[model samples]
Target: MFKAVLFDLNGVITDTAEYHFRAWKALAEEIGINGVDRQFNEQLKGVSREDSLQKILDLADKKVSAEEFKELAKRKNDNYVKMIQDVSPADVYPGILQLLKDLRSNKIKIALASASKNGPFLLERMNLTGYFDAIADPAEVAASKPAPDIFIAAAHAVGVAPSESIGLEDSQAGIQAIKDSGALPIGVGRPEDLGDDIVIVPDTSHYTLEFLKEVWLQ
Candidate 1:
């Protein structure tokens, strides 16, 4: 059985991606960055804000000075930070909270890994801080998905080896990070989107210990 589990915040935890997309779209237009719309965010899911900024600059295909670009990115991310400031425990996904409790009760270590710089503020505001054994402060981690550094750091935080842990994520880049860390990757999405190697579930509504046991605890 895996001893530790790491989870991504947006899609896997609370669907905060909706708020992120909205905030990002507003900023894209607000800063005159580029075409960040409903369909455009399809490419933005699980993406880091810095990468999203790059996409905005690149997709805008408009020449922008580098300093102005980073300044705009910071401005936009603060807006998103304000957006999620109100999420309380009531906002956690349906089945996931209990799953967290179940894992702790089963003596499994839990960690939260996300690229968002606001990870701590969000968890504290949501009253979900105590559930985790280790939570990566994106400020300290300084790495993004598909690099595996964050996941590896998270594994160390929980005092577990990567091979003894499991990770839950919603994007291919994140799944690849889990794989890179030598952990089992449980993705949240459809088979088509998540691909064939990783285990995929419909959403948090189906995320139960029974289902998780079938996947990881066996």
Candidate 2:
């Protein structure tokens, strides 16, 4: 029996993931080549901006000094921040707003646990900030996903034990972190995209209690 639903912000709720990808891809063009793509993007989904930069370097087979890394990282973030400015409620996935409403009506706690430092800002842009009972700020966490700190903090924020929470994630690290927190990992992508260990839905449009419970309980 889950008492709370912990959501990952970007690909799960808003379409900001697409913007982030585009921003990274743009940086790849300006720096390396056509090195950033969806498959590569999937690899760094639930980590900090710095962690993402390291992966990008790996993909591009490019090395930079510390100072150069800092400058490049800043440049990429500037591009990303500008790209996200146009996000609105119209960007939320189908069935998500209604699912949130249903969760509130049922007295189930909701928490936004995202790796993005701009999680709150994006939610505010969509006017969806008030929907969450708790939000895990990137600055508040000791570390990012695959560390278990973010989701653990989120469960605490909602006054729910990690044991009684269900995490909705769209990335490998996100799901792994939920498992590390003792919560059920409810994935939002194909098994091939995420992993075969966790059960996943075809799309978030089918992320209702009916579909989730049926598959999760089985």
Candidate 3:
């Protein structure tokens, strides 16, 4: 039986992908980097802002100084914050609230593992600040997703062994991180991208306490 659950913030717990896309796309356009497609945003999910910005700059073939990239990243963050200021619990992923409640009631410790430094703020905005027992953000980890650092940190913070923990993720990077951390991976949204150690769910709406017990607890 799993003792802990680690969740990714954006895309997994909240529907903020569109807002991120809009902010990044606008920034890309302003930098004369066209072709900021859905694929690009998908590739960036669960990645750190610094790495994502570097990838975008590379794809756009735009030579920007580190200072410039930082400036642009800050600007994009400002835009994203503005766009999501009105977001509320209504914007949370379907069934997420119930899932958290069920997990808590079942005595399962919940931890948040997200690459975004602003993840806590978003959680607070969505009335989810109290849902997680611990949080591991890229700002606190030595490395981001696909490196296992954040997930490992989260598990440690929650006082659970990686093998006794489960992770809910919405991106390939996050799936890889969970796998690397030796945890069971539950993939949401783009299930096709998941590899070994992962079980795919259509969305949070498809997951229930009973469903998790049946599929994962056994």
- The candidate that achieves the highest TM-score relative to the unseen native structure: 3
lDDT of 2 by residue, 1-218 (tens): 68888999877896577777888888888885665888888676888888888888887588899999999888988999998888888988887998898888888899988998888888898888878999988777888788889999899999998888888988888888999999888888789877888888877897786665565576
C-alpha RMSD by candidate, in order: 2.0, 2.3, 1.6
lDDT of 3 by residue, 1-218 (tens): 78988888886888688888899999999988877889888888888888878888888688988788789999999998899888788888888899899999999989999888888888998899898999886787887688899999989998997788888888888899999999888888654577544578877897677777666664
Best by lDDT: 3
Query: lDDT of model 2 at residue 81?
Result: 93
Off by over 4 Å in 1: 63-66
lDDT of 2: 0.84
TM-score of 2: 0.88
- How does each model score on TM-score? 0.90, 0.88, 0.93
Candidate 2 lDDT for residue 49: 89
The clash tally of candidate 1 reads 0
lDDT of 3 at 94: 88
Total colliding residue pairs, candidate 2: 0
Candidate 3: clashing pairs of residues:
none
